Design a protein around this motif. Structure first.
Motif, short mmCIF file in Angstrom:
data_model
loop_
_atom_site.label_atom_id
_atom_site.label_comp_id
_atom_site.label_asym_id
_atom_site.label_seq_id
_atom_site.Cartn_x
_atom_site.Cartn_y
_atom_site.Cartn_z
N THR A 708 0.78 -1.09 -0.02
CA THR A 708 0.02 -0.05 -0.10
C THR A 708 0.89 1.36 0.14
OG1 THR A 708 -1.57 -1.36 1.40
CG2 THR A 708 -2.14 0.99 1.16
N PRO A 709 1.11 1.93 -1.16
CA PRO A 709 2.01 3.02 -1.36
C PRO A 709 2.47 3.82 -0.13
CG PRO A 709 0.23 3.26 -3.05
CD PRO A 709 0.13 1.67 -2.51
N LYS A 710 3.69 3.96 0.09
CA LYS A 710 4.16 4.54 1.47
C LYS A 710 3.53 5.72 1.84
CE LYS A 710 8.27 6.64 2.37
NZ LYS A 710 9.61 7.01 2.01
N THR A 711 3.39 6.66 0.81
CA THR A 711 2.56 7.89 1.38
C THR A 711 1.35 7.69 2.02
OG1 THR A 711 2.75 7.85 -1.08
CG2 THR A 711 3.55 9.99 -0.08
N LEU A 712 0.56 6.97 1.27
CA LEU A 712 -0.85 6.66 1.90
C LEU A 712 -0.83 5.91 3.23
CD1 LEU A 712 -3.85 6.28 1.57
CD2 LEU A 712 -3.43 4.35 0.32
N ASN A 715 -0.29 9.08 5.68
CA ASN A 715 -1.41 9.43 5.78
C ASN A 715 -2.67 8.69 6.30
OD1 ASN A 715 -0.62 11.48 2.74
ND2 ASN A 715 -1.69 12.33 4.80
N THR A 716 -2.32 7.51 6.44
CA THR A 716 -3.33 6.75 7.22
C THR A 716 -3.13 6.40 8.51
OG1 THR A 716 -3.95 5.39 5.02
CG2 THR A 716 -4.55 4.42 7.05
N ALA A 717 -1.88 6.27 8.97
CA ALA A 717 -1.55 6.06 10.10
C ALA A 717 -1.86 7.14 11.21
CB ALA A 717 -0.02 5.69 10.18
#
Length: 835
Positions: A708-712, A715-717
């Protein structure tokens, strides 16, 4: 028709009044023809003079048909069948006139009636033409073929389809049978046609693949460069589709390919060039090329050298040079620095040579291996850079282009060595080379400067004063085209200097010219975007110093949106009447609209309140188009933190929209939506409670799924940490399941405003369900030992959690954890916090 005196003579004198070297005589035969070109008796009289009338001289008889073909391009629908019928006839009946120009015009007509007047409509056309290849009269075949050769280039996708009878079934093997012809022009045509279909993977051709190559490669030679041209061209495409044929004879091909890559006929080498380029495309065998790699490179490098004939165009499209350089690049990537051995010696010889040409070429090579041989290049740089910077002054115009562009190719090393030592002098000249009175040098320079800035990210803050004064003046001197690049050069600047740009004088020189370009741009302008694009960066970094300009700009932004949705709605209603909008217009307006809502912050409350935004906001988030939703969840979040005061009532309207839009398959679209929920999260406080249930579980699943793309993930954590802060009792029961991925993804971020807003949560959660982290505590610590500056209480908040747990396990049992620690983590922990 036939004769009729008056007409014929009137025609003849019109055609005679044509070749006059007079200008005012010309404006006569324009209208005095456009009038006859509405009077259908006309065209027939043309083909007549062209064909039947052999009394008049030949260049006349050519202009006869020319006009005809000119009408056929324009007014054909009109042409009564009875005309067209006859037209068709006289051209086939005169397909091989023994007088070149005529033969060519007559074919031109055929070419043109075929293309413009369908091909389901000239049934006889091909069937005839074919039977004419089989003629004896040479000229009445060269013509017969020349046509077909164009028809293939023109109606490629039609010939190879259900329209006539798929004549391709009969033409291909016929074309093959014609490789064994004598006179070269006919063979060259023979293959030329075949070629149209090699890419198109036609079954009518593949059926003779074996026989094709056979006739093709066995042929290879054929003194005449017209034939060689198309063979070469065949192999290039053939390399793509039927790779699984050439391999057997691969080594002879490649050795051949160098000779044709040096075929004295520029136009043959022109194509042979694109061979290696297309070879390197499929990385299906890096080993094969090495064999003769020391042989190709030098050749290839000489290709760069500006043809003595180009110093006229620039002092175009795709020449050997433009191909050669493009091919060298790709070779640098497959082979890495291993390519260098054959290149360095050669370089040395150029780069300095008396020639304002050969030197230039060396420079071009330097830029072509810049990235693929990047590492092996690092060492030398301290040599060339110096000179290269001097080179931006080289008197000849075109050198000052490549000198520049090659430098751009290395910025990453420039922005890796002491600021003053290499960057400084470069950006000095680079900047002066912007103001240059040579458009080609100009554009190169800015593009160079743009790249340079994406690399600086901080180094320019010193030199902004000078940067602007010239750039803002750059408008006083930049035509439309080089103006596009400035927007980016500006965009990158404010996008690379951050807030520092805010200065009452800096703004002074920068804003007026922008607003100037602003008003000269109507609301329909398709090059409006560029202006807004950088304006987004500008309003962003310019913070509150942008206030003087927004009350229009904002309203201008909402009005695009407003107008765009109306267009779509009406189209999503009467497609038969109103066409679809161009949504790419909203996207921008929306991006600028959160561009203010960023740096302009709390102040926006004015414009936001007395604006329809927060319904246009609602509509855009439902958009079936993604780029839209992306930049309206963006606006949402921005606004939410900028003025949730106005945003609140629309929450229970928005939350479901976001909750649906947590579909992870839309990369960025959902990455925003996630972040958005994080911002709402905080601003809501406990009142977030009813919403957590739906989003939460998804957020878990997202962050728990791999790849799951690192950036997302970040932004999710953060968003999960946000929710756990604002509503601990509801999220903490889940700790056990999402601690691991959270820690690991959030272990590597700058300790910004957001990171805090997350870790505050994870603790508040840990303090509800301590059992949550018992097995993955070692995970948690690795998360803490990332914090450089923890906001006082937060630092004491961690230390309280760590010390708390070391007590249930005790001293003797703390080693069962602590000993396991990596050396850095142990050292930052037993240091900055507790034991």
């Amino acid at each position: 028709w036939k004769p009729d005196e008056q007409g014929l003579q009137q025609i003849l004198q019109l055609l005679k009044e044509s070749q006059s070297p007079d200008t005012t005589i010309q404006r006569t035969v324009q209208q005095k023809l456009e009038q006859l070109n509405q009077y259908p008796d006309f065209n027939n009289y043309l083909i007549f003079v062209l064909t039947k009338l052999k009394s008049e001289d030949e260049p006349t008889r050519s202009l006869s048909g020319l006009i005809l073909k000119n009408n056929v391009k324009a007014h054909f629908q009109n042409f009564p069948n009875g005309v067209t019928d006859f037209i068709k006839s006289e051209c086939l009946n005169n397909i091989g006139d023994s007088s070149p120009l005529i033969r060519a015009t007559v074919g031109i007509l055929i070419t043109t009636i075929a293309s413009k007047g369908e091909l389901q409509n000239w049934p006889d056309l091909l069937p005839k033409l074919c039977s004419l290849l089989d003629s004896e009269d040479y000229n009445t075949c060269e013509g017969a073929f020349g046509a077909l050769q164009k028809i293939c280039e023109d109606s490629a996708e039609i010939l190879d389809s259900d329209v006539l009878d798929r004549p391709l079934n009969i033409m291909i093997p016929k074309f093959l049978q014609f490789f064994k012809h004598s006179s070269p022009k006919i063979r060259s045509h023979a293959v030329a046609c075949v070629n149209q279909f090699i890419i198109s993977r036609t079954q009518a051709l593949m059926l003779h693949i074996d026989s094709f190559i056979e006739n093709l490669f066995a042929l290879a030679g054929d003194e005449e460069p017209e034939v060689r041209k198309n063979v070469c061209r065949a192999l290039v495409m053939l390399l793509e589709v039927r790779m699984d044929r050439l391999l057997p004879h691969m080594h002879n091909i490649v050795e051949y390919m160098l000779q044709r890559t040096q075929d004295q006929d520029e136009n043959v080498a022109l194509e042979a060039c694109e061979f290696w380029l297309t070879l390197a495309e499929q990385p299906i065998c890096k080993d094969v090329l090495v064999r003769h790699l020391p042989k190709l490179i030098p050749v290839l490098v000489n290709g760069m050298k500006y043809s003595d004939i180009d110093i006229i165009l620039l002092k175009s499209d795709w020449n050997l040079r433009k191909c050669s350089a493009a091919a060298l690049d790709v070779l640098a990537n497959v082979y890495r620095d291993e390519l260098l051995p054959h290149i360095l010696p050669l370089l040395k010889e150029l780069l300095f040579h008396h020639e304002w040409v050969v030197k230039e070429s060396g420079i071009l090579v330097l830029g072509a291996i810049a990235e693929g041989c990047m590492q092996g290049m690092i060492p030398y740089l301290p040599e060339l850079i110096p000179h290269l910077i001097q080179c931006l002054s080289d008197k000849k115009a075109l050198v000052r282009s490549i000198t520049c562009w090659t430098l751009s190719r290395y910025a990453h090393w420039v922005v890796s060595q002491p600021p003053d030592t290499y960057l400084k002098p470069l950006m000095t000249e680079l900047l002066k080379r912007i103001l240059d009175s040579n458009k080609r040098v100009q554009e190169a320079a800015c593009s160079a400067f743009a790249t340079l800035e994406e690399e600086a990210c901080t180094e320019l803050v010193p030199y902004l004063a000078y940067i602007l004064d010239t750039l803002v003046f750059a408008f006083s001197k930049y035509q439309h085209k080089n103006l596009l690049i400035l927007y980016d050069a500006i965009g990158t600047l404010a996008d690379s200097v951050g807030h520092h740009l805010n200065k009452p004088e800096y703004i002074q020189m920068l804003m007026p010219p922008l607003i100037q370009k602003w008003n000269m741009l109507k609301d329909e302008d398709k090059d409006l975007f560029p202006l807004l694009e950088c304006l987004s960066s500008v309003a962003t970094a310019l913070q509150s110093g942008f206030l003087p300009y927004c009350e229009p700009v904002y309203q201008r932004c909402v009005n695009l949106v407003q107008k765009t949705l109306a267009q779509a709605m009406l189209n999503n209603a009467q497609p038969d009447q109103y066409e679809a909008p161009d949504k790419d217009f909203m996207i921008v307006a929306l991006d600028l609209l959160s561009g203010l809502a960023e740096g302009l912050g709390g102040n926006i409350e004015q414009l936001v309140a007395r604006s329809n935004i927060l319904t246009l906001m609602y509509q855009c988030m439902q958009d079936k188009m993604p780029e839209v939703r992306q930049s309206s969840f963006a606006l949402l979040g921005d606004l939410t933190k900028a003025c949730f005061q106005h945003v609140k009532p629309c929450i229970a309207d928005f939350m479901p929209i976001l909750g649906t839009n947590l579909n992870p398959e839309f990369i960025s679209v959902c990455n925003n939506a996630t972040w958005a929920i994080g911002e709402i999260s905080i601003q809501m406080g406990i009142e977030m409670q009813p919403y957590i249930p739906m989003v939460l579980h998804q957020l878990v699943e997202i962050i728990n799924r791999p790849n799951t793309p690192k950036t997302l993930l970040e932004n999710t954590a953060i968003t999960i940490g946000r929710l756990g802060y604002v509503c601990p009792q509801e999220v903490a029961p889940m700790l056990q399941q999402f601690i691991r991925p959270w820690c690991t993804s959030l272990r590597n971020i700058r300790d910004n405003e957001e990171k805090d807003s997350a870790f505050r949560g994870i603790c508040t959660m840990i303090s509800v369900n301590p059992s949550g982290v018992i097995q993955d505590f070692i995970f948690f610590c690795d998360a803490v030992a990332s914090w450089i500056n923890p906001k006082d209480d937060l630092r004491d908040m961690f230390c309280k959690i760590l010390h708390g747990f070391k007590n249930q396990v005790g001293d003797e049992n703390w080693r069962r954890f602590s000993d396991q620690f990596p050396l850095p983590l142990k050292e930052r922990l037993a240091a900055f916090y507790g034991v």
